[model samples]
Target: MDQFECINVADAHQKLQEKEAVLVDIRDPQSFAMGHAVQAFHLTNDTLGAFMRDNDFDTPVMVMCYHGNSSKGAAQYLLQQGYDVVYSIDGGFEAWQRQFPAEVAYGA
Candidate 1:
């Protein structure tokens, strides 16, 4: 009955700055390609399986989607998958861009 942690874009940015969590964007490829956090990794159906298999399950991860809701489920799933720490970004990418426009990378 454990819930993954939820963090605002400001906290998420701090985590990224401190290298505390690996940022994963779960939005579709096209959406991801348009723009994302500077160091975020895209997770798609094709890449997700391998990403799950190859990534360090112990690493802290932050999951992001178009909005905040989807990433909450994604974070919970990551916890089930043995990730020790997981965070869902509140307000998701839109907030991220609004809060830290300079930190986003466009054109994937």
Candidate 2:
């Protein structure tokens, strides 16, 4: 069995900056509306698989949530479903904000 790759907020940010990754926000729409990564896509946990099925599953996706747990599950779930490249932000949004405060914006 291969261990899937998981990244911390800093590395995730770097990946995003390098334009080599996609950010997926797993928080509900309400929280997502408040703030999230600039290019992040809203794909709540419950609808992740369905969203992937609809979109091309070939693309790499990075899942993230408030604290990181949900995104971890989302990443694992997607990996099991055959998504070749999947990643989850470690420590989630809180950590991301802590690392790069300027990157976060409040409100919809």
Candidate 3:
């Protein structure tokens, strides 16, 4: 079994900037729609099946939640689904919004 790694906003910034990983926002729809990382995609019960179905198992995943609390859970879940590597964003999207404000996006 592979274990998930925890990384702060800076690390997430680098990875996303370089296209090294795909970021998933596990926060609520309204919060996600209001604002999120540039490349972030919402991971809800509705889209989860399609997300797993479309992505390759070897693709690196960056799991993020509102406050980084639930990211670990989703990160571990992705690992069990055969993802090669998973990252839990520490401090979550809030941290990203604060430190990488320039990289944030609004509406979806």
Candidate 4:
């Protein structure tokens, strides 16, 4: 099976800052409201249809979760849905906050 590539938080930040990729947080709503990547879409099953309908499948999609685990499956799902370029940010949201605390957002 084809797999998504994993990247460190710093690289993910750079790509996101440069608008080279679209970030989708797979964390649950409660955890998401607590904190998430700045500008990340709160990706959920409910929003999946709209997300797929609105976003370009060719654009790179970056997925992240609590500890870099579940994001892989979400990334795979995006890839399976015709997103050829999908990346799972390794180390997850915690690692991302550690690497770039200033970039994290709280409450929506």
CA error at residue 55 for candidate 1, angstroms:
2.5
Inter-residue clash pairs, candidate 1: none
lDDT for model 4, on a 0 to 1 scale? 0.90
Instruction: Write model 4 residue lDDT over 8-102, tens digit each, in one string.
Output: 89899999989999999989899999989899999999999999998988888889899989999889888888888899999999998998888
Residue range with the least summed lDDT across 10 consecutive positions in model 1: 43-52
Runs in model 3 deviating more than 4 A are: none
What lDDT is reached at residue 97 by model 4?
90
The local distance difference test score of model 1 is 0.86
* Residue 102 miss distance in model 2 (angstroms): 1.9
Residue pairs in candidate 3 whose N, alpha carbon or C atoms collide under 3 angstroms:
none
- lDDT by residue for model 1 over 3-108, one digit each (tens)? 6898899998898899888899999878888989899988766787888887887778898999899998888887887777889999999999999999888766
* Candidates 1 and 4 compared by lDDT, better number: 4
Writing each residue's lDDT as its tens digit, candidate 3 over 1-108 gives 378899998988898889999999999989988998988889987898999898888888899998888999989888987997899999988898899888888887
TM-score of each: 0.90, 0.81, 0.94, 0.95
Q: What would the TM-score be for candidate 2 when compared with the true structure?
A: 0.81
lDDT digits (tens) for residues 1-108 of candidate 2: 233577898888888999887888888778877877777778865666677776566667888899888887778877787777889788988888788878875544
Instruction: List lDDT for all candidates, in order.
Output: 0.86, 0.79, 0.89, 0.90
Top-lDDT candidate index? 4
Q: Which is the better candidate, 2 or 4, if ranked by TM-score?
A: 4
For candidate 3, the 10 contiguous residues with the lowest summed lDDT are: 1-10
Scored against the true structure, residue 53 in model 2 reaches a CA lDDT of 75
